[PDB]
Amino acid sequence: EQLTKCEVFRELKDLKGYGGVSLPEWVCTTFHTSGYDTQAIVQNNDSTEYGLFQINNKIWCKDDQNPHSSNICNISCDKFLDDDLTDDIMCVKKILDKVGINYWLAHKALCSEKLDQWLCEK
Ligand SMILES: [Ca+2]
Ligand SMILES: [K+]
Prior knowledge:
CATH topology: Lysozyme
Helix content: 25-40%
Distance between the termini: 23 Å
Strand order of the largest sheet: 1-2-3
Number of domains: 1
Bound molecules: calcium ion, potassium ion
């Protein structure tokens, strides 16, 4: 589904403060990672990134292109293409505990300033 700014804000609530990443940062970073599309798939050769968070199948989750992934998150990648972002968040929380916010490249380029464009009021 195609989510909006504030939908994302609501829905990423359990991520608020985890890793010292605020909700506004994540709204921005998700926007600039998947365009708020929960079914977004990016792939090459090679590797494929899945969902709101563009969680990859090289080390994070398993799929048919890389069934031999380390599968850190202990899950099928395609669980990251439905609307329940509960499992997506638990995996992002693991990406954060081991490689940090810079897995998401949009964070530093696009979401390191003008965080006022990413607020949801009331
Ligand atoms: Ca999911
Ligand atoms: K979109």
